Write a protein that binds this ligand. Structure first.
Ligand SMILES: Nc1ncnc2c1ncn2[C@@H]1O[C@@H]2CO[P@](=O)(S)O[C@@H]3[C@H](O)[C@@H](CO[P@](=O)(S)O[C@H]2[C@H]1O)O[C@H]3n1cnc2c(N)ncnc21
Length: 1336
């Protein structure tokens, strides 16, 4: 080995000794160190044995021949040089290990081998090096090497194909367990779903099944066993030891991958330095440059692959951790004791299964960086120290200064997040009031007053939004300025400290790239530490939960079908609490009806709990015989259909089910319910009354067909007749359970004489049990008891911002881009200056221009960021105003017809998406896009002839981005949807655990929780593999960019300078992260901007007639006398109102009578123009209503509706939202409304803060407040809608409103009789038109 023929030569040939020693020791050596380790995996992991195939044999036969050929060399050598003996024998022996290895891999079930692939690849490269040397040298021993190389190449090609699957069916399988090594490395096996997801929108059944190891049925038992072993071995069992003993061995493979990734990441800058030296070192061979470029490419590709495999390992381990923790928590919760369960909140345990398990899932990613981040940083620092000197300390002095500052920013906006949120809550509250009370507002035309309050709350919100906006600007400013800041600081210090310090390309750009690989190892440290602390508290929470005690099954001697036996048994609800049932003894024979009798808190329900092993048995002997059906006091209802509630996971028997349903008198309940017995009962579905829930619980118990029934007050909530019917057909001796041992807890005497045995107790003690007649004859405790009683959406958003602001932001951001680019170009020009008299010709003016360029970059970064901040706030204001106007201008038919509920999330969730997320997303997406464009242009500018690589790589990027965004924003939705049922099922199980355990159906519910967690994992796993697929494709694109940039710089290093090549390579190295985040941000934008599209709704939705016409406005006293005339009125709704020709004279009391379905109420809607007249000419006095603007008439006519709607705020704002009427008028109207006494009583006087809907006020008061509103209006036309205070409101409407014309729609004839001229409506027609005297 000497440098003349290997390094400094036109023809670089490895020396003969090097060829025969190191190039042969490398591959043979690889298999020798891996062989032992590989038995661990081959042994621990097995999948059967693969059959005898031609491929496997072909590989084995070539392994035999290859060994022979290599030993044939030893034979010829035997037929001087020491290397001609040991090397052939070593190669033959490692070859014999290779063929044995494919043999054992067949035995252990391996379709494709990564070892048997990397090993052949390394051997091939070594053979290639010797091959080239041997063909450049030119029979005797050469031909043996050619045969060896050809066989090795064919072996390598064979090793790529995947063998047949073993005899270990698998519908919709996961191709991970069947794909070959190359597909697993490149993650190609998911591209199928990627293309298919782009064409056919994914559903829950298209998702692949889970591999056997990820199923909860294979990860929960191992954790359960390990935790049991630790618990039985122990003081204070530790969950962390269990965790790292159970899933640690699979996790430790991440360590190697992380170390290799770190080393390969650092290998980049070293090769960059070598290339910068090469371009500066003219008169050097081109072979060195091409070797350096190939080294860069191979290192980058290998680092990408290893890192992405590391990512997959960590995510799979986290998924297993989550699944196992979920399963163990479920089983523990099903086992733990009531005493230990009551202390912890139910919501606490649900949080235990949600937030702590999710934190454990996410922790697996940032746990290796506990050592990767420091070492990286340290190593990077050392390299930087090797490069420049102590001055670099000042260069990083600001990076470490950004870690706290940025943190301080985030925490700050969190407080802002708390402020904004608070105001938003108020806003939505107010909006909710308007949404459920839009009827009253339109009637009084108070819409604009409420719009003003909404705008005031919006101003309050936008103040905090403006402050957060200004804070966000500097956060972006620092992020973009960091690179320039570190470069300028370190370079200025380096130049100023000593004039002999020469700034070369290697001394500027290598340290510049080391700064880029320093940003990440340092900025993630706070996140890592915070996640570790949260995971530690989660470990504490899980450990204390999993160490809880449990109920004792031994307490009850459950025996297969003297039925219930208790002797001298005392039970507790806790270990230290006193007994609740002291010294209980009783024997219940088979098929006997026993009633527990006592007062409240006696211990009746405790007896049934004790028979189910729910109480803590401190002493005694209980021998319940046969299956037990428990009807609890608090009915537990599953959210499944009523049929499956009664069935309870049991085979449906139509005759038995139909005998059970009516015997519980559940037939009326089935009839009222919409779908019958298929209705979704429970908290989530249709709510049921308590009696119905008790009925369903009893029906479930009766269907379960147990021999022993424990009925803890099944008839508490059912009525007396229903209860007697139930007892007759179910519990009584002539019911369904005639031969069943029934034990009932009751406090009702009605069925007591029919009971075979009455167990009467007092204070948890057996007190003279016996039969009813005998107990009555004894006249003791029982007698005492008885005696007790789409590109256009982007343009729309730009218009909402305004064209000027958007254009200015784009221009300033382009200015930032050009400033950064010219900063880089200035650095390149600066690094190329010659050295005269031992110092650069120019070094102060270059620093000044560098500083000026960077300061300009910083000011424009802070500027355009502030622009979009103001723009975003402007757009939020304009969009909210437009949406509010469209909503309030729409007719009532819109509110009635629209799904009531889709407006609320539009005002709350989508508006929140607009004002906060959209500006941040547009900022970071635009930044990433122009970072990519800047990398491309600085590559193309420095090397003009590099435009041939842009088209293919752009096509690859476009295809990958299209497929990923389309197929990932759907997988995320699938996973989100699937997550909720797990926590819902845990809530159901937690709520019904006593019933679950009593029926002994805990195994079925354990299996059910298996399915839901597996379903969630089936959608979560493709998402992370999708991220990996993005990752590999985009890093391949970036590595191709790096390779082509370096290649095109090396091919023309002469017409180029060192600094230009350095800058090109540094930016090409950076471009990969920018590309990845550009795709991720584009996906974010695509699913985010649609909010604006759904906020631009109701833009054309038919609106009401204009509120103010102002061309045909009425006079101030429009209702001069109040002469109403319905001239052929017809109201569309086919026609509810038809042929209405009536005349109500001014100041004449008129009422409207009719049955349900008539046009009584619709007639009022005619007066106020709620629905446009299909055919009609209603005219008040001498003016048509349809011509008048809505507000005008709605202000000149008043209505007292069915249910008065009192809005949140003061009483004065309820009476006069506009505050138009003076305080004296309000006081007079309130006094005239029989409310002066009450209104003077509130401490806040007229400013009494009434809650949502006036909950604090009574219904009578709210009605009188509505009457006060009508009285304060002082209008000549008033309408009344009648449904205790009726006497008061009727007298008040008869007191002073006699001057005004009053229409009255009352469902009661008593009040209408007083009003003359009654109009009767049969089906919209005027049945009778005359006074009540003419009516009778
Ligand atoms: N191997 C690696 N080496 C270098 N860095 C790596 C990395 N892997 C991950 N990153 C991260 O990718 C981003 C790289 O920077 P960019 O891609 S140039 O821009 C960021 C990014 O686009 C997104 C968030 O990406 P992010 O996860 S937060 O963090 C950084 C970086 O830490 O928004 C931008 N961004 C970040 N902060 C701000 C801000 N205050 N104002 C405006 N835009 C901001």
């Amino acid at each position: 080995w000497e440098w003349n023929v290997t390094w400094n030569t036109s023809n670089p040939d490895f020396t003969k000794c090097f060829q025969n020693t190191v190039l042969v020791w490398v591959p043979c050596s690889y298999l020798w160190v891996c062989f032992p380790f590989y038995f661990l995996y081959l042994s621990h992991h097995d999948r059967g044995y693969i059959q005898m195939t031609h491929l496997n044999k072909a590989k084995t036969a070539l392994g035999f021949l290859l060994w022979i050929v290599c030993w044939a060399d030893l034979f010829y050598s035997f037929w001087l040089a020491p290397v001609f003996l040991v090397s052939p024998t070593l190669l033959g022996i490692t070859m014999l290990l290779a063929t044995f290895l494919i043999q054992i891999e067949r035995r252990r079930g391996v379709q494709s081998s990564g070892i048997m692939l990397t090993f052949w690849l390394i051997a091939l490269l070594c053979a290639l090096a010797i091959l080239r040397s041997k063909i450049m040298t030119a029979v005797f021993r050469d031909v043996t090497f050619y045969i060896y190389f050809s066989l090795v190449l064919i072996q390598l090609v064979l090793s790529c194909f995947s063998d047949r699957s073993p005899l270990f069916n698998d519908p919709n399988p996961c191709p991970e367990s069947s794909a070959s090594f190359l597909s697993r490395i490149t993650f190609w096996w998911i591209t199928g779903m990627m293309v298919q997801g782009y064409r056919q929108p994914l559903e829950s059944t298209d998702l692949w099944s889970l591999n056997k190891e990820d199923t909860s049925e294979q990860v929960v038992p191992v954790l359960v066993k390990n935790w049991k072993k630790e618990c039985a071995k122990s003081r204070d069992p530790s969950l962390f030891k269990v965790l790292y003993k159970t899933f640690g061995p699979y996790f430790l493979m991440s360590f190697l991958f992380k170390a290799v990734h770190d080393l390969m990441m650092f290998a980049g800058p070293e090769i960059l330095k070598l290339l910068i030296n090469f371009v500066n070192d003219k008169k050097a061979p081109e072979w060195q440059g091409y070797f350096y470029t190939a080294l860069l490419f191979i290192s980058a590709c290998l680092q990408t692959l290893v890192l992405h495999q590391y990512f997959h390992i960590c995510f799979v381990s986290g998924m297993r951790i989550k699944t196992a923790v979920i399963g163990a928590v479920y089983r523990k919760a099903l086992v733990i004791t009531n005493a230990a369960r009551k202390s912890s909140t139910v919501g606490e345990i649900v949080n235990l299964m949600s937030v702590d398990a999710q934190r454990f899932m996410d922790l697996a990613t940032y746990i290796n960086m506990i050592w990767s981040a420091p070492l990286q940083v340290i190593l990077a620092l050392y390299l930087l120290w090797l490069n420049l000197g102590p001055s670099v300390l000042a260069g990083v002095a600001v990076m470490v200064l950004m870690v706290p500052l940025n943190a301080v920013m985030a925490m700050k906006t969190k407080t802002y997040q708390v402020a904004h949120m608070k105001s938003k809550d108020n806003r939505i509250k107010l909006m909710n009031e308007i949404l459920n009370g839009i009827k009253v507002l339109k009637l009084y035309a108070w819409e604009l007053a409420f719009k003003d309050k909404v705008l005031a709350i919006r101003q309050e919100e936008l103040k905090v939004l403006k402050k957060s906006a200004y804070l966000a600007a500097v956060g972006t400013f620092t992020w973009v300025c960091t690179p320039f800041l570190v470069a300028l600081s370190t370079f200025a210090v380096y130049v100023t400290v000593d004039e002999n310090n020469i700034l070369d390309a290697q001394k500027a750009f290598v340290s510049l790239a080391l700064f880029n690989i320093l940003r990440f190892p340092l900025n993630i440290l706070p996140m890592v530490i915070s996640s570790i602390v949260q995971a530690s508290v989660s470990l504490k929470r899980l450990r204390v939960f999993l160490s809880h005690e449990d109920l004792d099954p031994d307490s009850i001697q459950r025996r297969p079908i003297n039925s219930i036996t208790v002797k001298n048994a005392t039970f507790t609800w806790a270990r230290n609490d006193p007994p609740t049932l002291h010294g209980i003894t009783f024997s219940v024979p088979e098929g006997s009806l026993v009633a527990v009798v006592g007062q409240v808190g006696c211990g009746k329900s405790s007896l049934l709990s004790a028979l189910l092993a729910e109480m803590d048995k401190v002493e005694g002997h209980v021998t319940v015989k046969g299956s037990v059906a428990y009807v609890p006091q608090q009915a537990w209802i599953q959210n499944i259909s009523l049929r499956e509630n009664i069935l309870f996971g049991r085979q449906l028997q139509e005759r038995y089910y139909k005998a059970v349903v009516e015997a519980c008198a559940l037939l009326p309940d089935l009839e009222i319910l919409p779908s019958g017995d298929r209705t979704e009962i429970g908290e989530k579905g249709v709510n049921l009354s308590g009696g119905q829930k008790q009925r369903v619980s009893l029906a479930r118990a009766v269907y379960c067909d147990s021999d022993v029934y424990l009925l803890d007050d099944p008839l508490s909530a059912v009525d007396a007749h229903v209860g007697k019917h139930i007892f007759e057909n179910v519990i009584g001796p002539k019911g369904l359970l005639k031969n069943k041992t029934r034990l009932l807890v009751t406090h009702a005497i009605s069925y007591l004489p029919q009971m075979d045995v009455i167990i009467v107790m007092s204070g948890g003690k057996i007190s003279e049990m016996g039969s009813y007649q005998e107990l009555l004859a004894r006249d003791g405790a029982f007698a005492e008891f008885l005696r007790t009683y789409k590109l256009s959406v982007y343009w729309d958003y730009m218009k909402a911002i305004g064209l000027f602001i958007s254009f200015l932001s784009i221009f300033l951001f382009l200015c930032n881009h050009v400033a950064s680019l010219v900063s880089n170009y200035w650095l390149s020009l600066w690094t190329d200056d010659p050295i005269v008299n031992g110092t650069q010709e120019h070094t102060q003016v270059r620093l000044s221009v560098y500083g000026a360029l960077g300061i300009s970059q910083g000011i424009t970064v802070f500027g355009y960021s502030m622009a979009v901040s103001i723009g975003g706030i402007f757009a939020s204001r304009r969009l909210h105003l437009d949406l509010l106007h469209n909503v309030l201008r729409s007719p009532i038919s819109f509110f009635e017809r629209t799904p009531s509920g889709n407006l609320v999330n539009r005002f709350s969730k989508e508006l929140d998406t607009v004002d906060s997320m959209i500006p941040q997303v547009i900022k970071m997406f635009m930044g990433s896009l122009f970072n990519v464009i800047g990398a491309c242009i600085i590559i193309l500018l420095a090397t003009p002839m590099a435009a041939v690589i842009i088209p293919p790589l752009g096509l690859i990027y476009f295809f990958v981005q299209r497929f990923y965004v389309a197929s990932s924003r759907q997988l995320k939705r699938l996973e989100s949807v699937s997550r909720s049922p797990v926590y819902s099922h845990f809530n159901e199980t937690l709520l019904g655990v006593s019933v679950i355990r009593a029926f002994e159906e805990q195994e079925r519910f354990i299996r059910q929780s298996d399915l839901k967690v597996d379903e969630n994992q089936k959608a979560y796993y493709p998402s992370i593999v999708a991220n990996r697929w993005l990752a590999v494709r985009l890093e391949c694109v970036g590595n191709c960019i790096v390779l082509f940039a370096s290649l095109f710089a090396v091919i023309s290093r002469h017409s180029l300078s060192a600094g230009l090549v350095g800058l090109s390579v540094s930016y090409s190295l950076q471009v990969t992260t920018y590309l990845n985040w550009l795709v991720r941000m584009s996906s974010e934008m695509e699913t985010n901007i649609v909010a604006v599209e759904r906020l631009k709704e109701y833009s054309e939705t038919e609106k009401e007639a204009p509120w103010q016409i102002q061309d045909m406005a009425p006079p101030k006293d429009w209702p001069q006398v109040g002469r109403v005339e319905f001239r052929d009125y017809g109201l569309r709704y086919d026609l509810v109102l038809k042929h209405i020709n009536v005349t109500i004279d001014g100041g004449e009391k008129v009422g409207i009578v009719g049955r349900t379905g008539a046009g009584k109420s619709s007639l009022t809607l005619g007066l106020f123009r709620i629905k446009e007249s299909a055919e009609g000419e209603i005219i008040i006095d001498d003016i048509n209503i349809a011509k008048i603007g809505l507000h005008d008439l709605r202000f000149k006519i008043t209505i007292i509706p069915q249910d008065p709607v009192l809005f949140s705020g003061s009483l004065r704002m309820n009476l006069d939202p506009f505050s138009q009427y003076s305080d004296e008028e309000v006081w007079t109207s309130l006094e005239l409304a029989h409310l002066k006494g009450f209104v003077s009583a509130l401490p806040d006087k007229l400013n009494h803060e009434c809650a949502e809907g006036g909950e604090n006020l009574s219904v009578g008061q709210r009605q009188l407040v509505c009457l006060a509103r009508a009285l304060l209006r002082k209008t000549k036309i008033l309408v009344l809608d009648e449904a205790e205070t009726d006497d008061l409101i009727q007298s008040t409407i008869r007191t002073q409103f006699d001057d005004c014309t009053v229409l009255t729609i009352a469902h009661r004839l008593n009040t209408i009789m007083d009003y003359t001229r009654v109009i009767v409506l049969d089906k919209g027609e005027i049945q009778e038109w005359g006074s009540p005297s003419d009516l009778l």
